[PDB]
Design a protein around this nucleic acid. Structure first.
Length: 85
RNA sequence: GUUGGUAUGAUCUCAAAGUACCAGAAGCCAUGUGAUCUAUAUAGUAUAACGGGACAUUAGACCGAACCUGCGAUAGAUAAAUAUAUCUU
Protein backbone atom coordinates (compact mmCIF):
# COMPACT_ATOMS: atom_id res chain seq x y z
CA UNK A 1 0.00 0.00 0.00
CA UNK A 2 1.02 3.66 -0.21
CA UNK A 3 0.97 6.21 2.61
CA UNK A 4 1.12 9.66 0.92
CA UNK A 5 1.47 11.87 3.99
CA UNK A 6 4.60 9.93 4.96
CA UNK A 7 5.62 9.32 1.32
CA UNK A 8 6.22 5.62 1.94
CA UNK A 9 5.26 2.28 0.46
CA UNK A 10 4.11 -0.05 3.23
CA UNK A 11 4.12 -3.84 3.31
CA UNK A 12 1.57 -5.21 5.78
CA UNK A 13 1.35 -8.92 6.61
CA UNK A 14 0.58 -11.37 9.42
CA UNK A 15 3.25 -13.59 11.00
CA UNK A 16 2.36 -15.83 13.96
CA UNK A 17 -0.94 -14.02 14.43
CA UNK A 18 0.75 -10.65 14.84
CA UNK A 19 0.00 -7.84 12.38
CA UNK A 20 3.25 -6.33 11.12
CA UNK A 21 4.09 -3.47 8.76
CA UNK A 22 7.32 -2.19 7.20
CA UNK A 23 7.99 1.15 5.49
CA UNK A 24 9.91 1.87 2.28
CA UNK A 25 10.62 5.57 1.77
CA UNK A 26 9.71 6.80 -1.72
CA UNK A 27 12.07 9.81 -1.75
CA UNK A 28 14.75 7.51 -3.18
CA UNK A 29 12.48 6.92 -6.18
CA UNK A 30 8.88 5.79 -6.57
CA UNK A 31 9.71 2.79 -8.75
CA UNK A 32 12.64 1.77 -6.55
CA UNK A 33 10.58 1.96 -3.35
CA UNK A 34 7.63 0.07 -4.83
CA UNK A 35 9.87 -2.68 -6.20
CA UNK A 36 11.70 -2.93 -2.88
CA UNK A 37 8.34 -3.38 -1.14
CA UNK A 38 7.24 -6.06 -3.61
CA UNK A 39 10.56 -7.89 -3.27
CA UNK A 40 10.32 -7.80 0.54
CA UNK A 41 6.77 -9.19 0.40
CA UNK A 42 7.80 -11.99 -1.95
CA UNK A 43 10.82 -12.82 0.22
CA UNK A 44 8.52 -13.09 3.25
CA UNK A 45 6.19 -15.37 1.29
CA UNK A 46 9.07 -17.57 0.12
CA UNK A 47 10.64 -17.88 3.58
CA UNK A 48 7.23 -18.66 5.08
CA UNK A 49 6.88 -15.58 7.28
CA UNK A 50 3.35 -14.92 5.96
CA UNK A 51 0.84 -17.27 7.57
CA UNK A 52 -1.68 -17.64 4.74
CA UNK A 53 1.03 -18.32 2.12
CA UNK A 54 2.98 -20.90 4.14
CA UNK A 55 3.65 -24.42 2.87
CA UNK A 56 3.71 -27.79 4.59
CA UNK A 57 7.50 -27.59 4.84
CA UNK A 58 7.29 -24.19 6.55
CA UNK A 59 4.66 -25.45 8.99
CA UNK A 60 6.77 -28.50 9.86
CA UNK A 61 9.87 -26.36 10.39
CA UNK A 62 8.05 -23.90 12.65
CA UNK A 63 6.46 -26.69 14.69
CA UNK A 64 9.88 -27.55 16.16
CA UNK A 65 10.33 -24.20 17.92
CA UNK A 66 6.64 -24.26 18.79
CA UNK A 67 7.28 -27.59 20.53
CA UNK A 68 10.30 -26.22 22.39
CA UNK A 69 8.30 -23.26 23.70
CA UNK A 70 5.40 -25.54 24.66
CA UNK A 71 7.73 -27.83 26.63
CA UNK A 72 9.08 -24.78 28.45
CA UNK A 73 5.50 -23.81 29.34
CA UNK A 74 4.74 -27.36 30.48
CA UNK A 75 7.74 -27.31 32.81
CA UNK A 76 6.58 -23.89 34.02
CA UNK A 77 3.16 -25.24 35.04
CA UNK A 78 4.13 -28.83 35.90
CA UNK A 79 3.05 -28.60 39.55
CA UNK A 80 -0.60 -27.95 38.63
CA UNK A 81 -1.25 -30.82 36.20
CA UNK A 82 0.06 -33.42 38.68
CA UNK A 83 -2.37 -32.72 41.54
CA UNK A 84 0.03 -31.21 44.08
CA UNK A 85 0.00 -27.59 45.32
C1' G B 1 -16.64 102.69 100.10
C1' U B 2 -14.83 94.26 99.02
C1' U B 3 -19.88 89.77 93.68
C1' G B 4 -17.24 89.29 88.08
C1' G B 5 -19.97 87.86 85.06
C1' U B 6 -22.21 87.95 79.84
C1' A B 7 -21.72 88.17 74.44
C1' U B 8 -18.80 88.77 70.19
C1' G B 9 -14.18 89.17 66.64
C1' A B 10 -9.71 86.35 65.74
C1' U B 11 -7.07 81.27 66.26
C1' C B 12 -7.26 75.83 66.43
C1' U B 13 -9.14 71.41 65.70
C1' C B 14 -7.50 69.36 71.41
C1' A B 15 -12.41 61.85 72.13
C1' A B 16 -17.06 68.37 67.28
C1' A B 17 -19.14 66.84 62.68
C1' G B 18 -24.31 62.37 57.67
C1' U B 19 -16.63 64.77 54.94
C1' A B 20 -12.41 65.72 59.39
C1' C B 21 -4.59 66.32 55.89
C1' C B 22 -4.51 63.61 50.95
C1' A B 23 -3.81 59.10 47.83
C1' G B 24 -4.74 53.85 48.41
C1' A B 25 -6.98 46.72 49.49
C1' A B 26 -8.43 42.22 48.89
C1' G B 27 -13.37 42.30 49.47
C1' C B 28 -19.40 43.11 51.00
C1' C B 29 -24.44 44.53 49.32
C1' A B 30 -28.25 46.39 45.54
C1' U B 31 -29.87 46.65 40.24
C1' G B 32 -28.67 45.34 35.65
C1' U B 33 -25.35 43.15 31.00
C1' G B 34 -23.38 38.81 29.22
C1' A B 35 -24.47 31.12 26.79
C1' U B 36 -21.80 35.20 19.50
C1' C B 37 -15.73 32.49 23.92
C1' U B 38 -16.79 28.43 26.95
C1' A B 39 -19.74 23.46 29.78
C1' U B 40 -24.20 20.89 29.20
C1' A B 41 -23.40 14.11 23.00
C1' U B 42 -26.76 20.41 18.97
C1' A B 43 -33.35 18.31 23.30
C1' G B 44 -34.17 17.02 14.50
C1' U B 45 -37.45 23.54 14.34
C1' A B 46 -32.68 22.42 11.22
C1' U B 47 -27.60 19.72 9.61
C1' A B 48 -23.29 17.48 6.77
C1' A B 49 -17.88 14.48 6.67
C1' C B 50 -14.80 10.11 6.93
C1' G B 51 -9.89 8.72 -0.10
C1' G B 52 -7.62 3.32 0.73
C1' G B 53 -5.34 -1.57 2.45
C1' A B 54 -4.37 -6.59 5.29
C1' C B 55 -8.52 -14.02 4.01
C1' A B 56 -9.14 -8.25 9.94
C1' U B 57 -14.53 -9.83 8.51
C1' U B 58 -21.69 -7.07 11.70
C1' A B 59 -16.10 -4.97 15.44
C1' G B 60 -16.66 1.29 21.07
C1' A B 61 -11.15 -4.28 15.60
C1' C B 62 -5.64 -3.20 13.04
C1' C B 63 -2.05 0.11 9.44
C1' G B 64 -2.86 4.70 7.55
C1' A B 65 -4.72 9.74 4.41
C1' A B 66 -8.60 13.89 4.67
C1' C B 67 -10.76 15.45 9.36
C1' C B 68 -10.33 15.88 14.93
C1' U B 69 -6.23 16.19 18.00
C1' G B 70 -0.30 17.39 19.37
C1' C B 71 4.21 13.12 23.17
C1' G B 72 9.16 14.84 23.25
C1' A B 73 13.01 17.53 21.35
C1' U B 74 14.77 22.95 19.14
C1' A B 75 13.74 27.88 18.72
C1' G B 76 10.61 31.50 20.02
C1' A B 77 9.40 32.89 25.01
C1' U B 78 10.51 42.75 24.55
C1' A B 79 7.33 35.86 19.08
C1' A B 80 6.24 35.43 12.34
C1' A B 81 1.95 33.53 16.67
C1' U B 82 -0.87 35.47 23.88
C1' A B 83 0.50 29.63 22.86
C1' U B 84 3.16 28.91 17.14
C1' A B 85 6.71 26.75 13.69
C1' U B 86 9.26 20.65 11.98
C1' C B 87 8.78 15.62 12.53
C1' U B 88 6.89 8.15 12.71
C1' U B 89 1.73 13.02 18.10
Amino acid sequence: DYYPRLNVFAVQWREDGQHRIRWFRAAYGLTRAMRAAENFRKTLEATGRVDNWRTARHLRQQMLERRQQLKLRKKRFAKISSGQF
